[PDB]
C-alpha cells in the first residue's frame, strides 16, 4: 500500500536521528541534519515531525544560533508540507536532571525544569503544535527512602497546573499528554502505567486539558496488554496521542519498529484504532512512531526502518478490515457473544428493586447449565490470526 497524509504518520527527530550510542557502546552513526530529516520523512510518507527542544537546538545555544536553526527548520517544513503536531522537552539528558526535572529533591532544579518547558511551549505554539508531550523519565527513584512519592505528586501537579494556566492565558490552545513508563532510566518511574497516569490527571485543576500518550513498549515492559489499556484510555477519553513501537516483554526498552515485538497485540491495536464505531476510527490523532533503528544499521537501514513502521501499520489495517468484513468472523463473533456485552445488564428502568424481584436472575437460575456452554473464543482467535497471516 501507500501512506497518505490522511494516515497521519508522524516521527520524532530523535527516532531516525538516533546515533546508536547505547548503555554499552559508542554511536555507530553520524548525526542527522534536521533539514535532511524533514526531507527524508516527507519522501517516505510522514505527514508531520516532532522533536525535543534539545534535538533541534543544541543545549546551550546562543539566541542567534537558536533563531538561525528554527528559521531553517521552518523553511524545510514550508517546502515539504510537513507539520509539527506535537513538541516535547528534554528533562532527562543533562546531569542537572539526574533526580528528575519537576520532582527533583532539589528545588532549584524544579524551577529550572518549568522554565525550560515554558520556552518550548512558546516555540511549539509558534510552529502550530497542538500537543505538549510530557515524559518524566527521571521522575522516580532507585531507593524507596529517597523520594517522598506524595510530595513528588504534589510538585508534579503544581508544575502542570502552571503550564495549563500559561497556555490558556497566552491563548496557545495546547493539550497536555503525560507519557507513563515503568522504569528506565530510573529504577522505578512515577506514573508507571497508563492507569496511574489517567488517575493522576483527574486530580489536576483543568483535567479537561490533560490526557495521556501511552507507548506500546512501555506497557509491555510490565507485561501488560497494550490494546486493553488503550481501550480503557479511550473509554475515559484520555487518548490525546500515542507512541507506536515494538518490545519483547519485560527487559530493557527496545524501541523496535511497530509490529516487530508483539505481532498479535499490534494487530488487535490497529483493529481497535481503525474499526471504531460508526465504521470510523475510534482514534483520530497522529500515529506517531517513537522507535529506534537498530545499532547494527547504517543510514540505509535507518530509512528502511522508517518505512517499515508505515508498511506494518498499513498491512495490519488491511487485515483488520478484512477480518471484520468476514462473514465467518461475523459468525464467530456472534457465537462468542462479543456484542451482547454492549446491551445493558439491566432492562431500561430496572434498578436493584426490580432485579431482586427477578427469580430468574438467582433463585431459579441454572448456573450449571449456563456454565457448560463454551464461548468459541479459540475459533474466533484462530480466524483473526489466519487473517493476519493472509491465509484467508
Amino acid at each position: 500500500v501507500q501512506a497518505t497524509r490522511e494516515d497521519k504518520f508522524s516521527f520524532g527527530l530523535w527516532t531516525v536521528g538516533w546515533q546508536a550510542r547505547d548503555a554499552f557502546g559508542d554511536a555507530t552513526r553520524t548525526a542527522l541534519d534536521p533539514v535532511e530529516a524533514v526531507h527524508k520523512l516527507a519522501e517516505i510518507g510522514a505527514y508531520g515531525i516532532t522533536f525535543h527542544d534539545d534535538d533541534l537546538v543544541p543545549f546551550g545555544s546562543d539566541a542567534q544560533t537558536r533563531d538561525g536553526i528554527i528559521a531553517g527548520f521552518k523553511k524545510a517544513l514550508d517546502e515539504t508540507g510537513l507539520i509539527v503536531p506535537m513538541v516535547t522537552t528534554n528533562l532527562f539528558t543533562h546531569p542537572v536532571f539526574k533526580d528528575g526535572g519537576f520532582t527533583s529533591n532539589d528545588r532549584s532544579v524544579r524551577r529550572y525544569a518549568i522554565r525550560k518547558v515554558l520556552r518550548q511551549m512558546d516555540l511549539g505554539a509558534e510552529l502550530g503544535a497542538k500537543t505538549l508531550v510530557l515524559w518524566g523519565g527521571r521522575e522516580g527513584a532507585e531507593y524507596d527512602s529517597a523520594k517522598d512519592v506524595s510530595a513528588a505528586l504534589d510538585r508534579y501537579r503544581e508544575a502542570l497546573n502552571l503550564l495549563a494556566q500559561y497556555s490558556e492565558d497566552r491563548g496557545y490552545g495546547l493539550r497536555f499528554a503525560i507519557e507513563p513508563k515503568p522504569n528506565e532510566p530510573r529504577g522505578d518511574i512515577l506514573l508507571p502505567t497508563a492507569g496511574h497516569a489517567i488517575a493522576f490527571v483527574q486530580e489536576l485543576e483543568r483535567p479537561e486539558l490533560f490526557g495521556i500518550n501511552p507507548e506500546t513498549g512501555n506497557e509491555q515492559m510490565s507485561n501488560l496488554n497494550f490494546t486493553q489499556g488503550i481501550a480503557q484510555a479511550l473509554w475515559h477519553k484520555k487518548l490525546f496521542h500515542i507512541d507506536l513501537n515494538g518490545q519483547h516483554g519485560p527487559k530493557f526498552d527496545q524501541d523496535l519498529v511497530f509490529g516487530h515485538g508483539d505481532l498479535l497485540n499490534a494487530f488487535s491495536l490497529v483493529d481497535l484504532l481503525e474499526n471504531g464505531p460508526d465504521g470510523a476510527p475510534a482514534y483520530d490523532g497522529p500515529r506517531h512512531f517513537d522507535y529506534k533503528p537498530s545499532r547494527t544499521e547504517d543510514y540505509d537501514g535507518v530509512w528502511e526502518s522508517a518505512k517499515a513502521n508505515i508498511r506494518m501499520y498499513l498491512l495490519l489495517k488491511e487485515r483488520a478490515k478484512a477480518f471484520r468484513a468476514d462473514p465467518e468472523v461475523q459468525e464467530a463473533l456472534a457465537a462468542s457473544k462479543v456484542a451482547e456485552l454492549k446491551t445493558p445488564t439491566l432492562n431500561p428502568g430496572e434498578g436493584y428493586a426490580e432485579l431482586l424481584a427477578d427469580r430468574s436472575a438467582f433463585e431459579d437460575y441454572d448456573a450449571d447449565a449456563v456454565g457448560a456452554k463454551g464461548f468459541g473464543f479459540v475459533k474466533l482467535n484462530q480466524l483473526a490470526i489466519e487473517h493476519l497471516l493472509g491465509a484467508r
Copy 2:
C-alpha cells in the same frame, strides 16, 4: 512483640482454610471449620476475619442450612470478640463465571452476578462489615477479539452504580474497594494495576463511595513498585483496604506470607503506612493478610504461617520507627533532600509571569554546577537496610 487489637490484623477465611489444591495437584489438607478458624485466629491476635460468601456457606446451600451456618458463625464471633471488617463474593469459582461475572459476554450471567453480590451485601451489613471488596478475577480475556473492553467497562460501571444505589438506599454505609490484578486466572484481567482501577473508579456515579484494595503480589506480578503505587493511592485518597502478602516478581500468584517475597519493599511499605504525617499512620483500615500457607505444610505449618504474617509486620514496624528516630538517618534524609520535595516549587503568590521574570530559574541558572552535586541516595539506602538487618 505481640499483636494488639489496635494493630488491626485480619485474615480471610480462605487463607488459613486453603486446602492446597493447586493447578497441578490435589489438596494436601482437609477443610477447616469456620468456627475453629475464628477461635484459632483470635488466639494468635487477629481482630477480624473476612470471607467470600462461598467460603462460609457452600454454594447452593438451602436456606435452613445457610441460616444455621450463619448463626453458629455469629456465636463464635461473639464469644471471641473478632469482627468482620470486610466481606466479598466469589464470582470466579463456578463454571458459570468462566467468562466473568459483571462482564461475561452472556447477559444472563451478568444478571446473576449482581444478585449474588446483593445477597452478600445484606449478609455483610448484618455482620457489620464496612467494606465490600470486589475482585473481578474472571473479567478479561485470553484472546483480544473475544472481549470488547469498552463494552466491558460500561457493564462493569453499570453493575457498580446499582450496588452503590442499593447500599445508599438501604442505609448500609458500605464503601467499595476494587482489587486490581494483571492476570491469573484470565490471560489478561481488566483493571490490571492500582492505577487502572483508580482511573475507572473516578467514572462511577458516586466516586466517593469507591476506592481500591491493592494486593502486594498483584503489583509485583507486573514487576511494579508496590510501595510507590500505594503512595499514589494515598495521594488520591483511595486506599480503602489493603491485602498484604509476598511474591517473587512476575510468575504465578504465590501468596507467600507478607515480607517473604520482596523484603526491602515490605520494609518501605510498613514505613509509609505507619510513619505517616503527624506521627500517626497514613492509613487506618485493616492490615489484611491474603496469603496461603504453602502446600508443603500441615495444620501446624498453617498456624505458624498465620503467626509469621503478624511477626513480619511488627518486626518491620519496629525497624521503620528506629530508622526515622536516628539521627544518622535524619541527617542522610536532609543531605538527600527528601523533605525539600514537600516545599512548593513556586513561591507563595508566584505565577508564570513572576517565574518567567526570575533569571535565576533559567538565564542565570548554572545547570552544570547543580548537575554535579550527589544526592547521597546510596548511603541512605544502606542505613535503611542496616536497620532492617538489626545491624543498627
Copy 3:
C-alpha cells in the same frame, strides 16, 4: 493445508482431556474418554497420542481394572493406526509429591517415585514408545533454606542412572527427555531452562541416552528466546522431543495453542525446525502439542483448538518456505552476512601463532570503517514478517 502422518503431530491425552479446573475455579468440562480421544485425534490428523500413567489408568486402579483399560486403549490405537511416541509419569498431582518425586526431602517418597516410573516404563515399552519424558514439576522450593540443591541434583542423578540401567538391561531402547520449567507449581523448579537441563544431563552415567523436552511456554515464562534456545539444543544434539504451545511472557503457564502467544517467535521456530541443513528438517521427532483448550470452551471448542494447533504449524511452515525461496530474502540474507558465520574464523591450518602474525587482524585493522557499515537486519526482519502475513 492438511496434516499427513509424515507431519508427525502428536497430542497428550491430558491436553484435549483437560477439564479446565484452574487455580481459582471448578471444572467446566466433563471427563474425556480415552478411546474417544484416540478416535477424535485420529480424525483431525494426529499421528500419535501420549499420556501420563494417571491420565489413562486412574490413580489406584486394581490390576483387573488397569488391565482392562490398557486392552481397550490398545484396540483403539489399532483401529485408528495411531502410535504412542512418548509416555510420561505423573509425579506431581498426588499430595505425597508435594515436595517432589525424585528430590523430595522424604526418602520414602523418592523410593516410591522411582517405582512409579519403572512401572510406566514397562507400559511404554509395551506400547512401542521411544521416549520417556520426565517433567520434575514438584522438584524445587518456595524458600531457599528448605532445599539443598546439591543433594537434590545428586538424588535426581541417582534416580535417572537407575532408569537408564533398567531400560538398557531389559532392551527397551528408550531415550530420556528432561523437561525444564522455571516455576509453577513450585516457587522455583530445579533445572529451570533448556540450558540448565542440558548441563545436568552431561553429568549422568549414560549421557548419550539423555536429552531434553523444552516447551515453548516454559522458556517464555522467563522471557527467553525460545527459537534461540532450540538452536543451541540442536547444536548440542540434545533435542529429543519438543512441546509446542503459546504464552504471553512471564505470568502463570497459559498453555495456549501453538502460535497464539509470541507469533514472531513461532514463525522463526518453524523456520528453524523445517528449513534444516540439506533442504531437510533439522528436527525429525514428533511435533507434540502440550496445550490446554481455554476454560471458556465446551467440547466443540476443544476440537477446534486441537485443529488450530495443526493449522498454525502448517500455515507457518508454508510462509517459512516461501521466505527462504525469495530471491529478495536471499539478497537480504547475503547483505546481512548470515552465511558468513558458517565460515570458520581461522583459515585451515591456522593457529594462534599464525593469527598473531596477521597484522591485518589487528595492527592494521580499521575497526572504525568496519563499525560504520550496516548489517541490514531490520530489512531482513521486515521481509520475514511480510511472508508471515501473506503480504508476499
Copy 4:
C-alpha cells in the same frame, strides 16, 4: 565488621569508575584515575582489582602510552599490596562490535576480536591474573533471521579453543569464565543463563579449563533464583568466579550494590557460599562486585557505595552463620528433612531388581498417609528472616 584480605573482595575498575552516562543522559561524574582507584580500593579493604583492556588503556593508545600506563598501574599495585585476580576484554563498546566479537556475521570482525583478547591475555599473565572473564555482550540478535545460532555456537567454540591452546602453550595457567546474560545490549544474547553457559562449555576441546562467572542481576533479569543457579554451578564444579550486585527483577540491568535488590536471595546466597561442607566455604574465589554507583551520586557517593557492598556481604555472613548455629534452626532443619536429601534413595548395592522386589516402595506404600505430613518449611523460613533481621 571489618574486611580482611582473606575475604577476597575485588572491584572492577569500571564499577567505581562509571561516569554515569546512561541510555538517556550524559555523564554526571568525571573520570577516575586508575592509580587513584587502586589507592581508594586498597583503603576500603579490597584485596584485588579487575579491568577491561580499554578501562586501563584508552582504545587506540600507542605502545609508548600503553606502556607508560601499565608501568604506573603496576607501581600502585606494588605500593598498596593489591593483586589482579582477573582481567577481561572489551568486545562490546566500539562500533565494530555492533553484531558481536567472536560471533559477528562479519568474518574480519571475528579475526579482530580474537587478536584483541590474545593481547589482553598477555597483560593478564604479566600481572598474575588467574582468570580470564569473557562477557559476550554483543553476541546475539534483535531479529530471529539475522543470526544463525548454530553457526554462532561453532564460531564461539572455534575462538575459545584457540584461546585455551595459546594459554596452555605459553604456560599462562589461566581459567576461562563465560559470563551469561539474557539480554541488554542485544535483544537476546547467546548463552542467556548459567545453565546455557555450562552446557556450552562441556562441548569445548579442554572443558576442564572452562567454567562460568554468573552475575546476580543477570539471572534475576529472567526472574530466576540466583542462589539455586549457583548451587547447580557448584554441583558441576564450574563456579570459576562470581559477580555480585543487585537488581529488581526483569527490567534494565540496574547494577545496584550487592543486597540492595532481592535481599532474601542475597542472604541465601552468602549462606550457600560460606556455610560449605565442614565449616569451610563452598566457594574459594574472589567475591567480586560488578555494580555501579547510582547516577545521582558524586565521588563521595561512589566511595560510600564501594563500602556498602563489603558491608552488606559481611552483615549477611554474620547472620548466615548465626542461623546455622541456632539450635532452634538446627531443629527446624531436622524437622524439614533438609539433610535427608543427602542420603541416597537406593540402599548400598541396590539396583532396579531389588527396588522392584521391595513392596514398601510401591505395593504396600501409603502415599495418602505420607502425603499428609507437613514439611515445616514456613517456620524454617521465618527463622532465617529473623536471623537476617537481627531479631534472633
